[PDB]
Design a protein around this ligand. Structure first.
Ligand SMILES: CC(=O)Nc1cc(-c2cccc3ccccc23)c2nc(/C=C/P(=O)(O)O)ccc2c1
Ligand SMILES: CC(=O)Nc1cc(-c2cccc3ccccc23)c2nc(/C=C/P(=O)(O)O)ccc2c1
Lengths: 343, 343
């Protein structure tokens, strides 16, 4: 498995990334302390996840470039670009965790929750973002796709932030309103908040690294990748509730947290005025009594079967997209990822 | 006065900036709400200040470019780049206000303190940052200084964030330690936190817009501009305490807020072990009794005269820098600004 293989050389490349990002401290000892803090931030925040978005950059680079044109240097840049994706994510997670008052991330305490950190994590989240562009400069400045990468990370930050704004408008911190939890609104939040950076960004960055810079190829890649993104989030919402917590490594939280899960959208789409009332009361409460009452309504409305039919239809449609829009890219670029996303 | 003049056309250009930044909503009504929120953010945060950094871009552009080469379009871009500086600042202020738990900014309630906003201002601060690069793309993508501007805003965000990290390490939220309040540390905080974006960035952006892209000219501009920045912050710390609040439009806060003011650095530099003890007790307290006791120690240590001698020496040195490093730029570029900074 292309991913499992690559994981070692990718994670060992983090040591280099940090060394390089703490190198300006040598010529400027004045900022040494801030750099020392920068090291803590990266070491805590960029490490610990599965590195799936970062690894997509590498996997795609290897499938888009001739093994002859995959010299030591190209690879060093490929791992760096994957790391910039992880850095982009680490920045939205640090920030999101502050914004949603989260306690834990990847099982460990959120960076902002650490004693001594707090709201100083806001500046930390900005520093993780700064590193993206610092790395792009250090590794890619002489490459023709340099401006291309800069722009894509930028466009992706804005897409995500715009997505976050939409999500923050939909489910406010102290407001319960299932009215604005529509299918049309859900797909948008997922497109802007998740899909762009999670799916478009990693292949898109490898495409540019391979010299595939065409507006249309990118648009074809985007057509496919955004749809995969839509399925991924819908699956994440399903696995949050109905998913066995052993394999996933997560416990049900969407219901308590008033989140705009696909389940609630579907529940709202298919409900009698009386069925809507029960959810109105139970959804959003930190009481196992009410949390179990919501799962009982989803079950009654046969949503686990509305999802199974959706996963069946989605995989079908994604293959129909791959057939239609892969060319001239190798279908393996999208098939490798689809394999990971669907079961 | 070059600034006072320019202010009108600059502030009227904000209407265009917002129109342009809310234009993607027309082709994507899905995100309309987020864009509507983006409008609130810009309208509140980017408007209300003196626009001094933004106006420096314009003033410098006008002094670096031949009036013949100052066509309608060049000007539209010049006002946009000035606006990107204001947008850069609006982003550090929104974030800083959250980080330091500030109540008011420019007399009005901090954006995060507004009912319904709160920590959602973190995402807002990120959106103001996104707009910089969105504008640069919309107005400057066909220009040879395009990558140059992108990079400078990026380098300046990181410089500022690195500065912020240093400042957050120096004076922690619940920790009183005057030991790390050194001259060497103060100059660094000021260089990274304030000087780079406030002084280098605006002239530097106009330089690139004028086709002055040389590493050495920029380094010469930087030599001068960073020194001006050092004087500006030292003056801001002085005016915070000893300055008449009518002309300034601010009331003394540094002492209560445990801030690494130049005054405290000087007080610490020139103090008997007994004089240090009095400050140790009084500095950082929300009690008019202790706040007045600190101002009495600064007064006794003749710091208002240590500042007057410093302002005398600084203006002298800044002129010696202008003589030495202005060429081939017109000295008026730096003299116009120095005029504004010194009395
Ligand atoms: C059927 C199924 O459970 N699929 C599946 C597939 C992936 C996934 C794999 C490869 C590339 C990706 C590229 C983009 C998005 C996802 C992926 C996946 N990723 C994560 C990310 C962890 P982190 O890196 O945040 O710490 C979590 C759960 C996942 C589940
Ligand atoms: C002797 C003296 O008080 N000088 C003086 C000069 C300026 C200043 C002028 C022009 C360009 C600049 C460019 C960079 C920095 C400062 C300046 C100045 N700016 C501000 C910024 C306000 P805002 O725009 O935050 O809302 C506040 C006080 C100021 C005082």
């Amino acid at each position: 498995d292309v991913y499992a293989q690559e994981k070692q050389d990718f994670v060992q490349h983090f040591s280099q990334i940090v060394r390089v990002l703490t190198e300006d401290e040598m010529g400027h000892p004045e900022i040494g302390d801030a750099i020392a803090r920068l090291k803590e931030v990266l070491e805590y925040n960029a490490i610990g996840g599965k590195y799936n978005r970062g690894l997509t950059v590498v996997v795609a680079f290897r499938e888009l470039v001739e093994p002859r044109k995959q010299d030591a240097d190209s690879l060093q840049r490929a791992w760096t670009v994957g790391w910039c994706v992880e850095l982009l994510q680490a920045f939205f997670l640090v920030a999101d965790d502050i914004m949603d008052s989260s306690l834990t991330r990847r099982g460990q305490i959120c960076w902002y929750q650490k004693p001594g950190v707090g709201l100083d994590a806001i500046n930390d989240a900005n520093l993780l973002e700064a590193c993206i562009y610092r790395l792009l400069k250090l590794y890619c400045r002489e490459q023709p796709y340099y401006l291309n990468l800069i722009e894509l990370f930028l466009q992706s930050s804005y897409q995500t932030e715009i997505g976050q704004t939409l999500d923050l408008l939909t489910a406010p911190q102290g407001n319960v309103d299932l009215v604005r939890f529509t299918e049309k609104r859900y797909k948008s939040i997922v497109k802007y908040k998740t899909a762009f950076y999670s799916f478009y960004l990693p292949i898109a960055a490898a495409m540019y690294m391979a010299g595939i810079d065409g507006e249309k190829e990118h648009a074809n890649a985007k057509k496919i990748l955004l749809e995969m993104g839509e399925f991924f989030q819908i699956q994440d919402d399903y696995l949050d509730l109905f998913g066995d917590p052993s394999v996933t490594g997560k416990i049900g939280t969407d219901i308590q947290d008033n989140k705009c899960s696909w389940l609630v959208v579907q529940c709202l789409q298919r409900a009698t005025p009386e069925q809507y009332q029960i959810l109105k009361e139970n959804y959003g409460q930190k009481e196992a009594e009410k949390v179990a009452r919501v799962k009982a309504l989803y079950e009654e409305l046969d949503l686990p079967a509305v999802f199974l039919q959706y996963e069946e239809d989605s995989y079908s449609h994604i293959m129909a997209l791959i057939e239609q829009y892969a060319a001239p890219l190798p279908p393996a670029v999208f098939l490798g990822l689809a394999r990971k996303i669907y079961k």
